[PDB]
Amino acid sequence: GRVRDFVAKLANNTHQHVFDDLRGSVSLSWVGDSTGVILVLTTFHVPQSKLYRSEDYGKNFKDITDLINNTFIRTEFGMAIGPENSGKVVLTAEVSGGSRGGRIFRSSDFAKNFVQTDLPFHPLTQMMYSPQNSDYLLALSTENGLWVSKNFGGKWEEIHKAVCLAKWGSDNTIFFTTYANGSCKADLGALELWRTSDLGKSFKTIGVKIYSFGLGGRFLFASVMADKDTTRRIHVSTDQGDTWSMAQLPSVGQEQFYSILAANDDMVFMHVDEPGDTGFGTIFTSDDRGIVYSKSLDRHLYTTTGGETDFTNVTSLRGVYITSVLSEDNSIQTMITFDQGGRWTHLRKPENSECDATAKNKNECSLHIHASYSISQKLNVPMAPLSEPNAVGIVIAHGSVGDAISVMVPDVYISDDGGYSWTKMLEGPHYYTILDSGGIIVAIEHSSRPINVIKFSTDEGQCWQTYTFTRDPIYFTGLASEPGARSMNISIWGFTESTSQWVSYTIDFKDILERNCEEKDYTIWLAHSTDPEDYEDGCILGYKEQFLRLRKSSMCQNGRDYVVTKQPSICLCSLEDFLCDFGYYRPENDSKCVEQPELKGHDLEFCLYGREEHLTTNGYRKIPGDKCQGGVNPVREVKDLKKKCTSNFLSPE
Ligand SMILES: *[C@@H]1O[C@H](CO)[C@@H](O[C@@H]2O[C@H](CO)[C@@H](O[C@@H]3O[C@H](CO)[C@@H](O)[C@H](O)[C@@H]3O)[C@H](O)[C@H]2NC(C)=O)[C@H](O)[C@H]1NC(C)=O
Ligand SMILES: *[C@@H]1O[C@H](CO)[C@@H](O[C@@H]2O[C@H](CO)[C@@H](O)[C@H](O)[C@H]2NC(C)=O)[C@H](O)[C@H]1NC(C)=O
Ligand SMILES: Cc1cccc(NC(=O)c2ccc(C(F)(F)F)cc2C(=O)O)n1
């Protein structure tokens, strides 16, 4: 344990609040950053709606149900909370069966005063704030009109009809799909993709034969129907639709799907579903254009039914992602990549962990991670893997140790180096959060039955101390805490036993970490270190990062203003910083990219109908987000591969 005098500190700081009876649908929303404002919304269906508010981080709520006029709020649309600190809150309310249109309750300041506005239409969707201006909203109506508002929902105007899907781009741009006749389901693949810069003053048709579309990073993606067929394929656009490239990705049937797994201004992770009811697909990573794709992972478990994947950005160390794959035998293994998908491997098992029945060898086994897929199978998993960018290196997850994901009741495992190494944090399932950029870690035992106790650790999970926060135990469902993992306030939620009420105990760790952190506590940490002795040690994507990192031994507060300190070393370029361009491959182990003897499959499709500027390749492209400098420069004098597809074909004219 190692902490002296904790019960004293936490006694004062434990704050209980009580709420009304089960069972009602419960919504909790944080409003703003550095505000402490929380909205709890409760709705009841029997032959109404309650709304509370707290400015103290959840220590004391007081009941503002007065401010909505006592009317009935609909949990379908929930609470549409404005971006950043704009403080916008919008609630959609239920109206009499035959009404003009719907009604919403608008707060422009952190839910202190609400104004009720009657809409000219009926909302089919939660209203969506424009990213650049929180005063801009768009909604889809039940008649499929696209409605827009410049004034934050006071006045609306219908800027197009027959709209399937509509999204805010950057700079108040709206992208939406329309349909000619029939219904969005009927005309699917026949959809038309539009853009409007001026909020409906003027439009442009950027797409046709559209199955679907989506945004990630700088890319606009659209899947387009074959003129000849039911197959579709991805086209990509960097200009917001003005020009369109066919991706080098396989086409799919109507059985299959694309999923954008992750996107950043450098690249995307694209999941392509496998033909047949596989339950798996292939992961591709793109180049910085989104045009050129590299096969990253085989048999990536993503289910056709319910849409579960285990795919996880480990957001506490750059380059690092974990995911599940379906082996040849039907068993699920976890895989981790440290280099942004350039290579996948098995997570290393804890030093002292021993293998389970899954493992065919008893001293030699991996760690496997419970994530969305596990949870969906009703395995005993209260939480998915957790990591925060402020807390460098830290990953917390339920797992098992063996050759595959085990159905047994999992322990909880922690990593401080971003997933290179692991130890058992806690035996048994737990709920966990991170406070104060890793200054504190907090855990609740997951029990079939009531708990009066919360666990906390100030050394990043190496040591734990038990605190009893209530002497009347609760049935415990969840933790609420301020997003961004910067506060010292945690809210334990649950209900009492039997004739009941929901309760929340919010604990301030304010005095548990009494003294502030200062330079002395931090220590120099090279990320991604494999071999100390090496010049190139810790180069990922062409460079190293050295971090200043809070000493495990130091017990103190990083503070709300804490800034991860790190400095880059820029590594010399090797071939391993380059990906094969179109029509090139690595045949041997050797990194070197050589010309393919000929194009096959979707390589041949791309070559046949492909956009011509990309056809000449350098054989080599710098991995996106790779910052390496100097060293090797294999990128080549451009060479036209157009003729080498068509050299086989007889040509006309
Ligand atoms: C996996 O998760 C990591 C950690 O969150 C992602 O890295 C983050 O990427 C975002 C977007 O590229 C970076 O955003 C920042 O946005 C501000 C403007 O709001 C801009 O001024 C900054 O220059 C920066 O772009 C964010 O800094 C970055 N976080 C860290 C710690 O590097 C990563 O993108 C995720 N991977 C994928 C493929 O999405
Ligand atoms: C934990 O919650 C308390 C509220 O109970 C937060 O206190 C606020 O602190 C800021 C700056 O320290 C003040 O400007 C606010 O006026 C305080 N509000 C109240 C109601 O006291 C405290 O910041 C939270 N702790 C952390 C680490 O975020
Ligand atoms: C889990 C699941 C189930 C069913 C469908 C999907 N994905 C898509 O429909 C999709 C989304 C985005 C894009 C685009 F934006 F990349 F183009 C293309 C498609 C596509 O399949 O055609 N995902």
Side-chain angles (χ1 to χ4, degrees):
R2 283 103 185 255
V3 175
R4 293 182 183 174
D5 289 345
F6 73 94
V7 186
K9 295 158 209 209
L10 294 169
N12 154 14
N13 293 313
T14 312
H15 298 91
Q16 164 217 274
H17 191 270
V18 175
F19 296 95
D20 64 64
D21 202 32
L22 62 80
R23 291 193 297 274
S25 286
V26 182
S27 290
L28 185 158
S29 292
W30 283 86
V31 183
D33 181 65
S34 293
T35 75
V37 174
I38 314 188
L39 278 192
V40 168
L41 174 76
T42 292
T43 70
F44 294 127
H45 312 278
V46 297
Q48 297 172 6
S49 175
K50 300 240 140 42
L51 183 69
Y52 309 83
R53 183 171 177 284
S54 166
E55 292 176 348
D56 42 41
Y57 278 81
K59 299 173 176 165
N60 289 277
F61 290 80
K62 293 179 179 179
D63 163 11
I64 60 173
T65 301
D66 299 294
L67 278 46
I68 61 171
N69 246 4
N70 288 42
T71 182
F72 182 70
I73 299 303
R74 232 170 72 184
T75 193
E76 327 181 33
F77 308 110
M79 308 190 266
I81 313 303
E84 299 185 319
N85 268 15
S86 64
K88 310 266 196 290
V89 179
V90 172
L91 314 186
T92 326
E94 184 164 338
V95 300
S96 326
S99 281
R100 247 197 63 199
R103 164 156 28 199
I104 58 175
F105 286 78
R106 302 172 313 145
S107 183
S108 69
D109 50 357
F110 304 97
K112 288 199 266 179
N113 311 258
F114 281 86
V115 42
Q116 163 207 251
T117 292
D118 281 283
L119 313 164
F121 59 97
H122 287 280
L124 180 55
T125 67
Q126 166 169 93
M127 298 171 177
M128 300 180 295
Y129 295 89
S130 172
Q132 183 146 348
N133 191 6
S134 80
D135 295 322
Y136 297 168
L137 311 177
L138 66 88
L140 233 55
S141 78
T142 58
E143 286 186 313
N144 288 287
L146 183 60
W147 292 79
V148 177
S149 161
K150 182 198 159 14
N151 67 346
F152 177 53
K155 190 208 103 169
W156 295 82
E157 185 62 15
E158 192 186 18
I159 71 166
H160 213 284
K161 324 180 98 167
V163 173
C164 278
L165 177 59
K167 285 166 187 174
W168 280 115
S170 46
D171 303 314
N172 305 335
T173 301
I174 304 172
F175 301 105
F176 64 92
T177 35
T178 55
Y179 62 95
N181 48 27
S183 81
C184 287
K185 293 179 179 179
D187 248 13
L188 166 78
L191 304 192
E192 203 167 13
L193 185 57
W194 300 77
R195 186 192 71 210
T196 180
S197 308
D198 38 32
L199 303 173
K201 298 184 176 179
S202 65
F203 295 91
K204 150 77 157 304
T205 277
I206 56 180
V208 76
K209 278 277 195 180
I210 305 298
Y211 187 92
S212 189
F213 83 96
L215 313 182
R218 297 176 300 118
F219 311 123
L220 163 65
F221 293 110
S223 52
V224 192
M225 276 282 127
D227 299 301
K228 61 181 292 181
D229 206 327
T230 68
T231 61
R232 62 196 192 271
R233 65 186 330 138
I234 300 295
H235 291 244
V236 64
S237 176
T238 53
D239 54 37
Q240 312 190 100
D242 288 320
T243 53
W244 286 94
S245 281
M246 160 191 296
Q248 174 218 20
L249 281 178
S251 38
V252 303
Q254 272 175 328
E255 295 302 320
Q256 290 165 271
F257 60 90
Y258 302 104
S259 205
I260 294 163
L261 295 175
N264 62 15
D265 283 344
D266 315 290
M267 55 81 85
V268 293
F269 281 88
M270 184 81 72
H271 178 92
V272 174
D273 198 44
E274 205 63 34
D277 186 351
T278 58
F280 69 85
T282 306
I283 292 191
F284 300 72
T285 52
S286 66
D287 78 341
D288 62 315
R289 291 174 300 185
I291 294 169
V292 175
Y293 281 81
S294 165
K295 183 178 179 180
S296 178
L297 197 47
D298 265 329
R299 294 175 71 83
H300 174 227
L301 188 159
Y302 199 129
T303 75
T304 314
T305 62
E308 331 303 338
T309 186
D310 280 337
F311 182 96
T312 291
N313 184 348
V314 180
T315 55
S316 57
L317 188 67
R318 172 184 63 96
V320 185
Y321 305 79
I322 66 158
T323 189
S324 286
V325 298
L326 176 57
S327 178
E328 295 301 326
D329 61 356
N330 293 322
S331 62
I332 308 148
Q333 297 101 52
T334 296
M335 303 292 284
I336 179 155
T337 179
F338 302 103
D339 56 351
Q340 206 176 67
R343 145 187 31 257
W344 298 82
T345 182
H346 291 259
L347 290 73
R348 155 157 17 87
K349 83 156 171 74
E351 139 180 355
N352 294 313
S353 290
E354 335 201 335
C355 299
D356 64 15
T358 297
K360 64 179 180 180
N361 184 327
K362 183 178 179 180
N363 277 26
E364 293 177 350
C365 55
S366 313
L367 181 67
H368 300 278
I369 299 303
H370 294 285
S372 290
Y373 187 78
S374 277
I375 286 148
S376 84
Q377 295 313 276
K378 304 311 159 207
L379 289 200
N380 199 309
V381 190
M383 273 186 75
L386 160 77
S387 58
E388 310 267 4
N390 329 125
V392 174
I394 290 186
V395 199
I396 307 177
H398 293 86
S400 64
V401 179
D403 293 11
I405 297 191
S406 171
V407 305
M408 298 184 37
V409 183
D411 315 313
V412 172
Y413 297 86
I414 197 174
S415 170
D416 63 24
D417 46 30
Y420 285 79
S421 61
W422 302 81
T423 42
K424 199 178 297 186
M425 207 184 81
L426 299 175
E427 22 179 7
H430 284 82
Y431 298 76
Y432 36 81
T433 80
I434 299 152
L435 304 169
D436 190 42
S437 300
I440 302 189
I441 307 189
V442 161
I444 299 282
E445 180 186 0
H446 173 266
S447 191
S448 63
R449 268 188 224 161
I451 47 99
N452 57 331
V453 166
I454 188 166
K455 311 169 167 189
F456 69 116
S457 160
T458 44
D459 57 18
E460 295 183 356
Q462 263 166 37
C463 289
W464 290 86
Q465 323 91 24
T466 273
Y467 166 61
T468 278
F469 58 86
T470 186
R471 139 186 60 74
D472 297 289
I474 63 177
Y475 275 93
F476 177 80
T477 59
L479 308 152
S481 88
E482 206 202 45
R486 282 179 186 259
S487 79
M488 306 207 58
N489 296 296
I490 179 73
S491 291
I492 307 172
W493 285 82
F495 48 95
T496 60
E497 24 184 353
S498 295
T499 163
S500 149
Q501 327 73 49
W502 291 90
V503 60
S504 70
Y505 293 87
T506 289
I507 305 174
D508 201 336
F509 276 89
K510 162 178 30 180
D511 301 311
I512 277 278
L513 310 182
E514 56 154 281
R515 64 167 188 94
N516 299 331
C517 292
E518 63 185 342
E519 63 185 342
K520 183 178 179 180
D521 289 345
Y522 309 90
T523 200
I524 317 184
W525 183 66
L526 173 59
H528 288 288
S529 178
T530 299
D531 184 1
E533 295 284 0
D534 215 355
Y535 198 48
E536 304 238 3
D537 186 53
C539 303
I540 286 295
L541 265 59
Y543 68 106
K544 333 174 161 217
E545 287 175 321
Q546 276 199 4
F547 281 78
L548 277 185
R549 226 194 158 177
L550 182 62
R551 267 173 231 280
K552 306 225 187 314
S553 94
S554 300
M555 171 191 316
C556 68
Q557 171 182 3
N558 291 316
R560 296 199 63 87
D561 60 357
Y562 171 83
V563 170
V564 172
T565 297
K566 67 196 188 156
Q567 43 205 14
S569 315
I570 307 294
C571 291
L572 257 69
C573 284
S574 62
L575 297 170
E576 303 211 324
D577 297 289
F578 294 83
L579 68 106
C580 289
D581 205 328
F582 183 53
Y584 280 69
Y585 79 117
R586 297 172 153 95
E588 293 177 350
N589 162 30
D590 184 1
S591 295
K592 183 178 179 180
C593 280
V594 72
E595 207 170 349
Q596 234 144 338
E598 293 177 350
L599 311 161
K600 177 152 149 310
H602 67 87
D603 278 294
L604 186 59
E605 286 173 341
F606 186 21
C607 202
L608 292 176
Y609 323 90
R611 202 194 244 131
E612 33 283 34
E613 162 263 303
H614 322 308
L615 290 183
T616 75
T617 69
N618 325 86
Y620 285 107
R621 274 193 95 89
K622 225 165 196 187
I623 289 164
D626 188 309
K627 294 182 182 148
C628 72
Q629 282 256 7
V632 175
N633 182 80
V635 60
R636 263 277 316 158
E637 297 73 347
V638 308
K639 174 176 182 179
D640 179 19
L641 287 201
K642 160 208 66 62
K643 85 168 64 188
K644 244 164 221 202
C645 289
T646 59
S647 55
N648 299 323
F649 303 82
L650 185 68
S651 312
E653 176 253 338

